[PDB]
DNA sequence: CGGCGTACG
DNA sequence: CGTAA
DNA sequence: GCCG
């Protein structure tokens, strides 16, 4: 078992679901306290279990696995022996965990804002609605639409949204393409938003595209919320039988020269990409982002025509999107 | 012990 | 500060 | 919290 998530296939469904979910609770709780190192270790330990070929049944099977030390092993031991880990259950029922989770789930609210509200004594969404002076326009939209945004986005919703986005993109710039990214490209059947990556086969023609796309979607009445730019974090109006629902949609534009890097980055998972960028820099001395891959010694950028190119330039076996579910 | 991804709005 | 994978 |  290699130490970095980008070195091993991680399927969407696996054989250690309960164990990984418990470790991810502790990772999430660490993030709510600003403990980014412990968040990473618990996320990585969870991801290792996702990559295993069969269930962990005995504590000895953790021997030699990367990112399992005293603490993560004790969590697993307790789950194996008792079906529950006292620390995990204590986190789950804690007022701090439940409120930070509730607040950070709001679009426009991060850990720092949620924590300040928590310290001020706020605990519920109606507490926030009662004092709208302390809310940004973004947070107001996130709170108004919070119920719909808490409802899973289905693969059926995705096809309908993609046709609508393609219509606007085609008028904004004939020839431009729309690619489904994020968790749905990794094979997820549900999500909390839909991610699209837009480009054009003629380098440079994509400049200034996203404002033109957004204006057209807005004129169709499809935009419930949005803020020169190349990423848009929108709330869309999605038809439903006899009604509609709000759905988060992310639109991103990249020039075709960068498209493989943007596709790789926006396909995720989030942990997979952090691990890939960490691997690139620490193991290969190369600097990776969603625009390119930089050699800081030669001061040169690697040209890539495909995701396969990028895995090759990093010395990694190719993983299709369905095996990037770290 | 230092390090822990790297961008854009 | 928020957002993104 | 764990790795190197
Ligand atoms: Cl930490
Ligand atoms: Cl409607
Ligand atoms: Cl980036
Ligand atoms: Mg997504
Ligand atoms: Mn998204
Ligand atoms: Na949030």
mmCIF file of N, CA and C in Angstrom, chain A residues 34-94:
data_model
loop_
_atom_site.group_PDB
_atom_site.id
_atom_site.type_symbol
_atom_site.label_atom_id
_atom_site.label_comp_id
_atom_site.label_asym_id
_atom_site.label_seq_id
_atom_site.Cartn_x
_atom_site.Cartn_y
_atom_site.Cartn_z
ATOM 1 N N UNK A 34 -9.752 23.811 13.419
ATOM 2 C CA UNK A 34 -8.559 24.364 12.807
ATOM 3 C C UNK A 34 -7.344 23.464 12.827
ATOM 4 N N UNK A 35 -7.522 22.165 13.071
ATOM 5 C CA UNK A 35 -6.403 21.227 13.192
ATOM 6 C C UNK A 35 -6.205 20.547 11.841
ATOM 7 N N UNK A 36 -5.568 21.286 10.913
ATOM 8 C CA UNK A 36 -5.468 20.818 9.532
ATOM 9 C C UNK A 36 -4.568 19.598 9.398
ATOM 10 N N UNK A 37 -3.539 19.473 10.243
ATOM 11 C CA UNK A 37 -2.690 18.290 10.192
ATOM 12 C C UNK A 37 -3.441 17.030 10.579
ATOM 13 N N UNK A 38 -4.180 17.084 11.689
ATOM 14 C CA UNK A 38 -4.963 15.926 12.105
ATOM 15 C C UNK A 38 -6.101 15.632 11.128
ATOM 16 N N UNK A 39 -6.708 16.667 10.543
ATOM 17 C CA UNK A 39 -7.683 16.454 9.472
ATOM 18 C C UNK A 39 -7.066 15.632 8.351
ATOM 19 N N UNK A 40 -5.855 16.004 7.923
ATOM 20 C CA UNK A 40 -5.223 15.282 6.819
ATOM 21 C C UNK A 40 -4.925 13.833 7.192
ATOM 22 N N UNK A 41 -4.367 13.591 8.378
ATOM 23 C CA UNK A 41 -4.063 12.212 8.739
ATOM 24 C C UNK A 41 -5.324 11.352 8.778
ATOM 25 N N UNK A 42 -6.407 11.856 9.397
ATOM 26 C CA UNK A 42 -7.626 11.062 9.472
ATOM 27 C C UNK A 42 -8.232 10.849 8.082
ATOM 28 N N UNK A 43 -8.193 11.869 7.216
ATOM 29 C CA UNK A 43 -8.657 11.706 5.832
ATOM 30 C C UNK A 43 -7.839 10.659 5.095
ATOM 31 N N UNK A 44 -6.507 10.720 5.248
ATOM 32 C CA UNK A 44 -5.628 9.774 4.566
ATOM 33 C C UNK A 44 -5.840 8.353 5.075
ATOM 34 N N UNK A 45 -5.989 8.182 6.398
ATOM 35 C CA UNK A 45 -6.224 6.850 6.954
ATOM 36 C C UNK A 45 -7.542 6.288 6.434
ATOM 37 N N UNK A 46 -8.578 7.122 6.399
ATOM 38 C CA UNK A 46 -9.843 6.689 5.832
ATOM 39 C C UNK A 46 -9.653 6.258 4.390
ATOM 40 N N UNK A 47 -8.915 7.061 3.617
ATOM 41 C CA UNK A 47 -8.742 6.752 2.199
ATOM 42 C C UNK A 47 -7.980 5.445 1.994
ATOM 43 N N UNK A 48 -7.016 5.130 2.872
ATOM 44 C CA UNK A 48 -6.304 3.864 2.779
ATOM 45 C C UNK A 48 -7.291 2.705 2.863
ATOM 46 N N UNK A 49 -8.237 2.788 3.789
ATOM 47 C CA UNK A 49 -9.204 1.705 3.931
ATOM 48 C C UNK A 49 -10.073 1.579 2.696
ATOM 49 N N UNK A 50 -10.409 2.707 2.061
ATOM 50 C CA UNK A 50 -11.187 2.652 0.834
ATOM 51 C C UNK A 50 -10.461 1.901 -0.274
ATOM 52 N N UNK A 51 -9.126 1.899 -0.253
ATOM 53 C CA UNK A 51 -8.320 1.298 -1.303
ATOM 54 C C UNK A 51 -8.025 -0.177 -1.059
ATOM 55 N N UNK A 52 -8.411 -0.709 0.100
ATOM 56 C CA UNK A 52 -8.126 -2.100 0.413
ATOM 57 C C UNK A 52 -9.018 -3.032 -0.399
ATOM 58 N N UNK A 53 -8.547 -4.245 -0.688
ATOM 59 C CA UNK A 53 -9.304 -5.164 -1.534
ATOM 60 C C UNK A 53 -10.353 -5.977 -0.798
ATOM 61 N N UNK A 54 -10.438 -5.876 0.528
ATOM 62 C CA UNK A 54 -11.391 -6.661 1.303
ATOM 63 C C UNK A 54 -11.552 -6.012 2.678
ATOM 64 N N UNK A 55 -12.528 -6.462 3.474
ATOM 65 C CA UNK A 55 -12.765 -5.816 4.769
ATOM 66 C C UNK A 55 -11.638 -6.069 5.764
ATOM 67 N N UNK A 56 -11.330 -5.048 6.566
ATOM 68 C CA UNK A 56 -10.508 -5.242 7.755
ATOM 69 C C UNK A 56 -11.358 -5.925 8.819
ATOM 70 N N UNK A 57 -10.895 -7.095 9.275
ATOM 71 C CA UNK A 57 -11.570 -7.871 10.303
ATOM 72 C C UNK A 57 -10.775 -7.972 11.596
ATOM 73 N N UNK A 58 -9.468 -7.764 11.540
ATOM 74 C CA UNK A 58 -8.611 -7.920 12.705
ATOM 75 C C UNK A 58 -7.614 -6.778 12.738
ATOM 76 N N UNK A 59 -7.235 -6.392 13.951
ATOM 77 C CA UNK A 59 -6.361 -5.241 14.113
ATOM 78 C C UNK A 59 -5.017 -5.476 13.445
ATOM 79 N N UNK A 60 -4.564 -6.726 13.408
ATOM 80 C CA UNK A 60 -3.273 -7.028 12.801
ATOM 81 C C UNK A 60 -3.213 -6.612 11.335
ATOM 82 N N UNK A 61 -4.355 -6.570 10.643
ATOM 83 C CA UNK A 61 -4.369 -6.178 9.237
ATOM 84 C C UNK A 61 -3.995 -4.715 9.029
ATOM 85 N N UNK A 62 -3.957 -3.908 10.094
ATOM 86 C CA UNK A 62 -3.520 -2.524 9.969
ATOM 87 C C UNK A 62 -2.010 -2.394 10.012
ATOM 88 N N UNK A 63 -1.307 -3.441 10.446
ATOM 89 C CA UNK A 63 0.147 -3.391 10.526
ATOM 90 C C UNK A 63 0.742 -3.096 9.159
ATOM 91 N N UNK A 64 1.581 -2.079 9.104
ATOM 92 C CA UNK A 64 2.216 -1.712 7.869
ATOM 93 C C UNK A 64 1.427 -0.753 7.006
ATOM 94 N N UNK A 65 0.146 -0.536 7.281
ATOM 95 C CA UNK A 65 -0.616 0.399 6.450
ATOM 96 C C UNK A 65 -0.183 1.832 6.732
ATOM 97 N N UNK A 66 0.023 2.646 5.712
ATOM 98 C CA UNK A 66 0.402 4.039 5.965
ATOM 99 C C UNK A 66 -0.740 4.817 6.587
ATOM 100 N N UNK A 67 -0.380 5.740 7.470
ATOM 101 C CA UNK A 67 -1.265 6.698 8.127
ATOM 102 C C UNK A 67 -2.078 6.089 9.255
ATOM 103 N N UNK A 68 -1.782 4.849 9.651
ATOM 104 C CA UNK A 68 -2.377 4.215 10.822
ATOM 105 C C UNK A 68 -1.348 4.153 11.934
ATOM 106 N N UNK A 69 -1.539 4.992 12.937
ATOM 107 C CA UNK A 69 -0.760 4.932 14.148
ATOM 108 C C UNK A 69 -1.657 4.619 15.316
ATOM 109 N N UNK A 70 -1.238 5.082 16.495
ATOM 110 C CA UNK A 70 -1.932 4.735 17.728
ATOM 111 C C UNK A 70 -3.398 5.139 17.676
ATOM 112 N N UNK A 71 -3.679 6.367 17.220
ATOM 113 C CA UNK A 71 -5.025 6.923 17.350
ATOM 114 C C UNK A 71 -5.993 6.292 16.344
ATOM 115 N N UNK A 72 -5.635 6.271 15.052
ATOM 116 C CA UNK A 72 -6.527 5.684 14.057
ATOM 117 C C UNK A 72 -6.702 4.190 14.279
ATOM 118 N N UNK A 73 -5.654 3.507 14.762
ATOM 119 C CA UNK A 73 -5.767 2.073 15.018
ATOM 120 C C UNK A 73 -6.713 1.803 16.176
ATOM 121 N N UNK A 74 -6.681 2.656 17.201
ATOM 122 C CA UNK A 74 -7.591 2.480 18.327
ATOM 123 C C UNK A 74 -9.035 2.693 17.898
ATOM 124 N N UNK A 75 -9.278 3.672 17.020
ATOM 125 C CA UNK A 75 -10.625 3.865 16.500
ATOM 126 C C UNK A 75 -11.110 2.594 15.818
ATOM 127 N N UNK A 76 -10.268 2.008 14.963
ATOM 128 C CA UNK A 76 -10.661 0.805 14.237
ATOM 129 C C UNK A 76 -10.853 -0.358 15.205
ATOM 130 N N UNK A 77 -9.928 -0.519 16.159
ATOM 131 C CA UNK A 77 -10.031 -1.587 17.146
ATOM 132 C C UNK A 77 -11.371 -1.529 17.866
ATOM 133 N N UNK A 78 -11.781 -0.328 18.299
ATOM 134 C CA UNK A 78 -13.033 -0.203 19.036
ATOM 135 C C UNK A 78 -14.228 -0.543 18.155
ATOM 136 N N UNK A 79 -14.201 -0.117 16.892
ATOM 137 C CA UNK A 79 -15.287 -0.466 15.988
ATOM 138 C C UNK A 79 -15.346 -1.974 15.749
ATOM 139 N N UNK A 80 -14.188 -2.622 15.598
ATOM 140 C CA UNK A 80 -14.163 -4.066 15.384
ATOM 141 C C UNK A 80 -14.670 -4.805 16.613
ATOM 142 N N UNK A 81 -14.291 -4.335 17.799
ATOM 143 C CA UNK A 81 -14.617 -5.049 19.033
ATOM 144 C C UNK A 81 -16.031 -4.759 19.523
ATOM 145 N N UNK A 82 -16.547 -3.543 19.315
ATOM 146 C CA UNK A 82 -17.803 -3.123 19.920
ATOM 147 C C UNK A 82 -18.825 -2.553 18.945
ATOM 148 N N UNK A 83 -18.475 -2.380 17.674
ATOM 149 C CA UNK A 83 -19.360 -1.798 16.684
ATOM 150 C C UNK A 83 -19.510 -0.299 16.769
ATOM 151 N N UNK A 84 -18.831 0.337 17.714
ATOM 152 C CA UNK A 84 -18.936 1.764 17.949
ATOM 153 C C UNK A 84 -17.637 2.217 18.596
ATOM 154 N N UNK A 85 -17.229 3.449 18.286
ATOM 155 C CA UNK A 85 -16.056 4.077 18.874
ATOM 156 C C UNK A 85 -16.522 5.233 19.746
ATOM 157 N N UNK A 86 -16.209 5.168 21.047
ATOM 158 C CA UNK A 86 -16.735 6.159 21.974
ATOM 159 C C UNK A 86 -16.351 7.578 21.569
ATOM 160 N N UNK A 87 -15.120 7.781 21.108
ATOM 161 C CA UNK A 87 -14.722 9.133 20.724
ATOM 162 C C UNK A 87 -15.566 9.635 19.565
ATOM 163 N N UNK A 88 -15.791 8.775 18.575
ATOM 164 C CA UNK A 88 -16.580 9.165 17.414
ATOM 165 C C UNK A 88 -18.001 9.509 17.829
ATOM 166 N N UNK A 89 -18.600 8.685 18.693
ATOM 167 C CA UNK A 89 -19.967 8.959 19.126
ATOM 168 C C UNK A 89 -20.050 10.243 19.941
ATOM 169 N N UNK A 90 -19.035 10.519 20.760
ATOM 170 C CA UNK A 90 -19.008 11.754 21.534
ATOM 171 C C UNK A 90 -18.951 12.964 20.612
ATOM 172 N N UNK A 91 -18.164 12.875 19.542
ATOM 173 C CA UNK A 91 -18.132 13.949 18.553
ATOM 174 C C UNK A 91 -19.500 14.114 17.908
ATOM 175 N N UNK A 92 -20.089 13.001 17.456
ATOM 176 C CA UNK A 92 -21.355 13.048 16.731
ATOM 177 C C UNK A 92 -22.440 13.785 17.504
ATOM 178 N N UNK A 93 -22.560 13.517 18.801
ATOM 179 C CA UNK A 93 -23.649 14.112 19.562
ATOM 180 C C UNK A 93 -23.288 15.467 20.146
ATOM 181 N N UNK A 94 -22.062 15.944 19.949
ATOM 182 C CA UNK A 94 -21.664 17.182 20.596
ATOM 183 C C UNK A 94 -22.313 18.393 19.929
#
